[PDB]
Design a protein around this nucleic acid. Structure first.
Ligand SMILES: N#Cc1cccc2c1[C@]1(CC2)NC(=O)c2c3c(c(O)c(=O)n21)C(=O)N(Cc1ccc(F)c(Cl)c1)CC3
Ligand SMILES: N#Cc1cccc2c1[C@]1(CC2)NC(=O)c2c3c(c(O)c(=O)n21)C(=O)N(Cc1ccc(F)c(Cl)c1)CC3
Ligand SMILES: [Mg+2]
Ligand SMILES: [Mg+2]
Ligand SMILES: [Mg+2]
Ligand SMILES: [Mg+2]
Ligand SMILES: [Mg+2]
Ligand SMILES: [Mg+2]
Ligand SMILES: [Zn+2]
Ligand SMILES: [Zn+2]
Lengths: 184, 368, 368, 184
DNA sequence: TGCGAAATTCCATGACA
DNA sequence: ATTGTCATGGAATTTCGCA
DNA sequence: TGCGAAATTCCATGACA
DNA sequence: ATTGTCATGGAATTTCGCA
């Protein structure tokens, strides 16, 4: 069997609804399976149209051999199936109610959901402008298993933005009280 | 100098006047019978006015000015006097063209890594397409990998919006651009400082300096032209297609596509290269690090027969950027303060301003 | 061609397929282990679609198209097939640039006598001066003697008015001009026929053909520029001064002014030449007839390393005159009917129209 | 003494008032003394201003060393004297009531006055457009004394307009009656 | 150890307005 | 306070297939 | 029969938008 | 159914002045 490579598999999913930011409510999350590189796209809905518009931006940079997702409406539609067939992309689904990806990808999606929650608190309506910094943080985060960050694995070089300050990602008592105050 | 001409009529030798000729007085003026004919020798006190009168007829150069003078007069080293007037005529100095080519171009080293240097520039105005008129082109210097963004104007706001999307992937060390309003604004300088990005600017009115992105602008326009043959010029929807097409196009001299230089592996695009299938990603990245260092690099071409290279203290003239109708194409002489490299200089104009200019936009002031 | 590939799998030799290689079947397709790696051999019936698919990604040339194909496939003489597709792609043929320079310029013989040929052209629009915007420039081919007329438009009426004033002195055999509206009008053709003047036209969009007058336009503008330094651009009153100044200016290569070539004697202007004072007018005219025949004549320069010269039957493409944004710079192939000289040809486009064009506005269609 | 040359002397004079043609009433006649070459300029008056405007056109082609004329107001003015001094032109006048030029010039001015009279008859208001053809005729008219026409003597070549048809210049009985009918 | 042809490399030309 | 670039297709040169 | 310098000739460069 | 041109000022080369 051939070694794992970048672009072999892209794992996509939706995060949201989130508080509105510049008219956006969702985040389409794309994670390369091999490198763990993350691309984030703000959408106004978890629809096929929003997925196709966002993925057309990504697939102008790199096309995956396979796209992996859950059985979400946007991904199981015949329109999304036509879009993938047109690009030579094989669609792969997880069994309903059983989301399976990979250890690395599951861990990455945890970091994304937690990093977003940490930065939402205090400014839940300003996340659109934070998407570029959130991605750089994630892609410049060292992998204990692989020895390299997603950026190093994708480009084969060190980055000009090393994220040496390995932040808490966990919430403070102040942030916990502020988050529970927002849930009112 | 009627004293100098007095000793001449008497018959005693004066340095500059050949002794083998007959100097005489006629019609109240010193004359000489020379092979060409009898010429009037004016006193040195009259020569400056004569040279200036001949030159001013049509503001002629050395030979054309001399040929008029030689019709009536003769004196020692006439061209030395002609050249003194040519070098003092402000009208000729700022209006005449240069006849000395610039020295051979520099072939700057290819940036060592992707994201070391970006070359950014605008294409447009283009026929309107979905309300869009411009294209922001971002070329990575090492790889040649290009990102395309449609804009409604070549503005700071549109550049910033586009670059905030691009820099989600990686932040570059340097951003090289020309001196377009969008890139020289304090809002853009602030945007770069905020991110640790150094802004490098091309010398003014020298797009060759931004050669890396200019060259990609040609390929972008050529592909959009081809795709739009016998169809309306709806380019907006083609930018993603053109971006992907060019990033995956082989450079016959390198034998690599910009995508391969950036990632070291082809994605799921047609005719993807399969040569590293049995290699691990680490083995593949090791081969990519080797490929990136052994890329062909061109060397400066030979200098032309009559080129000029700048020297500190030299009087040079900057070219007028947008000369008005019937107005000089050159500025008044400037002095070369520093020679940054054989193709770039720091000059001090008559105002006292320091300007970093390309020698392509300079001529050395004639007649010293 | 699955029949051709069948005998190959069996093991018997087919012309074009090296016998030293192992041809096998895998995943329902004919493969070959080559030094570069294992490549798929498609049947001849599939190759045209493959070449076209690879080419169409970015409408690439020979090597860039081949490098994509070579990633997955191998077949005998691949580039022969690539070139067949390149030469049939209308989008590439009309959009790509030429990489063959025109042959060396012709240096047409100097007209033998003054008034044999006039070169006429317009300068403008210039900053308005007394309601005037243009200058009609008339250059005698032999002498270089120029006449200047201020006009409000580059029109037939203004040309006719000016030329009726000039032709009071002498009528020319030929009037050479470009294809500007003022000169190609039936009213101007009628004006010339009425006088026995033959109208000669430059090939379209080739001002080098009118080189004699274009070159004088530079001198006119250069002198007006100099005279107007630090003054408003009131050129109207300077046209008579500029005309007289240039007509009495030495050409350093000829060692004669246009006035001297026309009259054989200087008029009462500054620094008038006095060398023929003791000659009779007949002796003076005899010396002038001799001077006019011994003038320096330049010869065609060397051809560049990669120049092209037209051949009857050859497929060539005329350059689009004013190409719109994102539109081809070349017309569809044309055939060379007649080679008038190595720099001028008669072509037949796809419409069936006969056009006399300069090779500077042509490229030979690539890939035959 | 040095041989006679073109531009040594220009003999100028006014012809008119003539019937109005394109608003013009006079003709300033310039004849080169040596070659006998003629330049004609329509003026609206025999004034210094009209002379200077017309001669500025001619002196943009060739400057004479000397200008010869009668004691006409336009030529004796201090303005015309200033114009000549500015151009290095010496002004020369004939004694009042004694117009002296040269045999060749006197004969040329006769041909001009007669050629104009011949063409005026029938179309006395259309002479402005005929000035170019009148000049070509005169300058391509063979000189019995010199063997060459003014054009040959000025340019040292044959012309593209030889005036082989040596016309009458004298009036017909029809033209005489038509001219005497105009004088009514 | 060398031939004919195919493959590769060279590189002038031109355009980024 | 900076600096030309590189796709293109004939021609020149090298390599390949075979002996 | 030759030297140093002045004079002349050569000619690449660039602009006629 | 026509076609490049030539002013310009350093450099290269020739000629001049004298011996
Ligand atoms: N116009 C304009 C204009 C409008 C807005 C802002 C600015 C300009 C601006 C300077 C800043 N002004 C210019 O004149 C200009 C130009 C080019 C520019 O990218 C460019 O930004 N500018 C350019 O791309 N080109 C093409 C070219 C020509 C020759 C070459 F050798 C190369 Cl490499 C490229 C030249 C003109
Ligand atoms: N504009 C325009 C235009 C307006 C009205 C009528 C016409 C034009 C017209 C063709 C007819 N169209 C043109 O494009 C044009 C030009 C020039 C013209 O004299 C000229 O009449 N035309 C011209 O003089 N130039 C300069 C130039 C450039 C490169 C050179 F090698 C030489 Cl020798 C001269 C080029 C453009
Ligand atoms: Mg899920
Ligand atoms: Mg720009
Ligand atoms: Mg540009
Ligand atoms: Mg024209
Ligand atoms: Mg022109
Ligand atoms: Mg009189
Ligand atoms: Zn001057
Ligand atoms: Zn094509």
């Amino acid at each position: 069997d051939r070694p794992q490579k970048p672009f072999d598999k892209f794992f996509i999913d939706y995060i949201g609804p989130l508080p509105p930011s510049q008219g956006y409510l969702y985040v389409l999350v794309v994670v390369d399976g091999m490198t763990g590189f993350t691309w984030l796209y703000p959408t106004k809905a978890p629809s096929t149209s929003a997925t196709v518009k966002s993925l057309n931006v990504l697939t102008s940079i790199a096309i995956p051999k396979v796209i992996h997702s859950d059985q979400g409406a946007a991904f199981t539609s015949s329109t999304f199936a036509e879009w993938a067939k047109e690009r030579g992309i094989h669609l792969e689904f997880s069994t309903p109610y059983h989301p399976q990806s990979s250890g690395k990808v599951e861990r990455k999606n945890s970091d994304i959901k937690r990093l977003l929650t940490k930065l939402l608190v205090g400014r839940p309506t300003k996340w659109y402008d934070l998407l570029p910094v959130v991605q750089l943080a994630l892609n410049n985060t060292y992998s204990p298993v692989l020895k390299y960050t997603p950026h190093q694995l994708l480009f084969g070089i060190d980055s000009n933005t090393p994220f040496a300050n390995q932040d808490t990602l966990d919430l403070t008592r102040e942030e916990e009280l502020s988050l529970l105050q927002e849930i009112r | 100098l009627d004293a100098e001409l007095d000793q001449l009529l008497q018959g005693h030798y004066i340095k500059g006047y050949p002794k083998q000729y007959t100097y005489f007085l006629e019609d109240g003026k010193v004359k000489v019978s020379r092979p060409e004919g009898v010429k009037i020798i004016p006193p040195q006190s009259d020569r400056q006015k004569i040279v200036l009168q001949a030159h001013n007829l049509a503001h002629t150069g050395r030979e054309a000015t001399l040929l008029k003078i030689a019709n009536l007069y003769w004196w020692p080293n006439m061209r030395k006097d002609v050249v003194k007037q040519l070098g003092r005529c402000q009208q000729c100095l700022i209006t005449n063209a240069s006849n000395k080519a610039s020295g051979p171009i520099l072939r700057p080293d290819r940036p060592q890594k992707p994201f070391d240097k970006f070359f950014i520039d605008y294409i447009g105005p283009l026929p309107p397409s979905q309300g869009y008129l411009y294209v922001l082109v971002v070329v990575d210097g090492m790889t040649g990998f290009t990102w395309l963004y449609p804009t409604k104007a070549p503005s700071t706001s549109a550049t910033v919006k586009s670059l905030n999307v691009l820099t989600s992937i990686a932040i570059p060390k340097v951003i090289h651009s020309d001196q377009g309003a969008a890139f020289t604004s304090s809002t853009f300088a602030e945007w770069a400082k905020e991110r640790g990005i150094h802004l490098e600017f091309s010398t003014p009115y020298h797009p060759q300096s931004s050669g890396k992105v200019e060259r990609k602008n040609s390929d972008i326009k050529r592909l959009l032209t081809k795709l739009l043959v016998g169809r309306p010029t709806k380019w907006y929807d083609l930018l993603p297609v053109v971006q992907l097409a060019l990033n995956n196009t082989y450079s016959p001299v390198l034998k690599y596509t910009p995508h391969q230089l950036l990632f070291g592996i082809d994605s799921n695009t047609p005719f993807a290269n399969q040569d590293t299938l049995d290699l691990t990603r680490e083995e593949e990245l090791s081969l990519l690090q080797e490929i990136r260092t052994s890329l062909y690099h061109p060397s400066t071409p030979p200098a032309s027969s009559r080129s000029w290279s700048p020297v500190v203290g030299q009087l040079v003239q900057e070219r007028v950027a947008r000369p008005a109708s019937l107005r000089p194409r050159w500025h008044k002489p400037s002095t070369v303060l520093k020679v940054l490299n054989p193709r770039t200089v720091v000059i001090l104009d008559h105002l006292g301003n320091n300007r970093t200019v390309s020698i392509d936009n300079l001529k050395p002031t004639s007649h010293q």
